Design a protein around this ligand. Structure first.
Ligand SMILES: [Zn+2]
Lengths: 82, 132
């Protein structure tokens, strides 16, 4: 799990859902997943995509996945595994 | 071998806060503990400051006036007693969540569980306070 091209879209949605639901054993584990998410996406907003959305953005797990997918596609980045 | 790990009872009044409560965390000495939270926690015994911290965020999760300014993901976090994530621009490395600060430091005889001595800070602000 070293790049976003290592994840299928469904696998990435799983990761994001876990984060959004705080489905972890400690705050430390949650912080680690968030850091991982920021490293995978390379998105300039970082954790704000999950925790500080801009007005009207869809901050559900599927909405965050869409925002990442579209940003990567439009900004010359590799996409999800087939 | 740390004062903050000795049991004590919570005391203090806190202050009225509004929607900009957590916006205040990145400024000055940080945001106060809300009066509404102080009403709930006063007189409860805590086995460590970390246990007090957990209780603050659980009460935040239960309070409609405080929780309504957190998005669904941050709501999930505070429901588990975790500190919520700040905006990216207030984070510093692996410090990404709101931090509880003692206005008069414990090392200088500040009270550990007096909520009038406690503030909510961002990582960026808390680091700057402790450096002047
Ligand atoms: Zn401090």
């Amino acid at each position: 799990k070293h790049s976003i091209s290592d994840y299928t879209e469904a696998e990435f949605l799983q990761l994001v859902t876990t984060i959004c639901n705080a489905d972890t054993s400690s705050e430390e584990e949650l912080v680690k997943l968030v850091t991982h998410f920021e490293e995978m996406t390379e998105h300039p907003s970082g954790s704000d995509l999950i925790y500080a959305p801009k007005e009207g953005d869809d901050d559900s797990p599927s909405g965050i996945v869409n925002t990442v997918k579209q940003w990567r596609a439009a900004n010359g980045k590799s996409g999800f595994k087939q | 071998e740390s004062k903050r790990n000795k049991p004590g009872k919570a005391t203090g009044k806190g202050k009225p806060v509004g929607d900009k409560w957590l916006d205040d965390a990145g400024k000055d000495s940080g945001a106060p503990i809300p009066d509404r939270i102080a009403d709930k926690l006063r007189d409860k015994e805590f086995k460590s400051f970390d246990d007090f911290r957990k209780a603050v965020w659980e009460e935040v999760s239960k309070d409609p006036e405080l929780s309504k300014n957190l998005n669904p993901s941050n709501k999930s976090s505070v429901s588990k007693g975790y500190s919520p994530f700040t905006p990216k621009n207030q984070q510093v490395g692996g410090r990404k969540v709101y931090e509880l600060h003692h206005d008069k430091p414990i090392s200088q005889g500040g009270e550990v569980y007096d909520m009038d001595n406690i503030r909510v800070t961002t990582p960026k602000r808390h680091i700057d306070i402790h450096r002047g």
